């Protein structure tokens with residue numbers, strides 16, 4: 592329960608979405624709200640990544656290559672998790688919950704129903720925070736960057752969290768021996784949500800004027 596518990600120990604406190612009650616809800620209102628929210632989560636994810644046992648010792652050039660590859664998947668994974676104790680809604684933040692009608696209004700119904708599949712599949716198999724923490728970290732390790740300096744040391748980080756997930760699953764879950772595989776086999780749908788999400792993010796020109804790669808190196812200092 593070592594890495595799992597240490598992952599568990601390194602979760603960030605809940606950050607809050609804080610929508611304007613002054614502004615009539617709209618397309619522009621929703622995208623503004625979620626934009627500011629993700630910006631704040633990203634600050635917290637650079638912080639949370641630094642606590643991944645092993646992440647700190649790699650290149651700065653490779654620390655970017657992961658976050659730049661994982662950050663949307665990690666955003667989505669958090670939202671997926673908060674969303675289980677609800678029904679057919681997405682909990683971006685405790686104070687911000689979007690349902691089908693609200694997705695259709697932000698121009699995200701397509702993407703959200705996909706993320707709602709991941710909500711469903713996880714709750715269908717009663718996912719545990721220990722499993723969430725360890726999967727969330729796995730997604731950051733296996734983001735498949737195009738350009739890694741130590742293509743060896745990353746596989747180490749993958750192999751460790753991989754072991755952690757088997758050791759834990761073997762341990763607290765002997766009811767199902769083909770269960771980490773099940774857990775690992777959700778990773779694909781989570782890539783497709785992220786891939787579509789990232790594409791939309793560009794199509795409506797949300798990247799701003801400093802490239803994401805530039806912002807990630809700043810924070811990692």
Ligand SMILES: CC(C)N1CCN(c2ccc(/C(=C(/CCCO)c3ccccc3)c3cccc(O)c3)cc2)CC1
Pocket residue numbers: 622625626627628629630632666667670683699702703706788789791792793797798799806
């Ligand atoms: C200027 C730059 C530094 N910024 C800009 C904003 N950007 C951003 C905006 C929006 C998002 C999300 C979404 C979620 C839609 C899923 O249904 C999104 C994606 C594409 C288009 C419209 C909404 C998001 C995801 C999960 C959690 C969450 O809080 C926010 C992420 C990131 C981050 C960086």
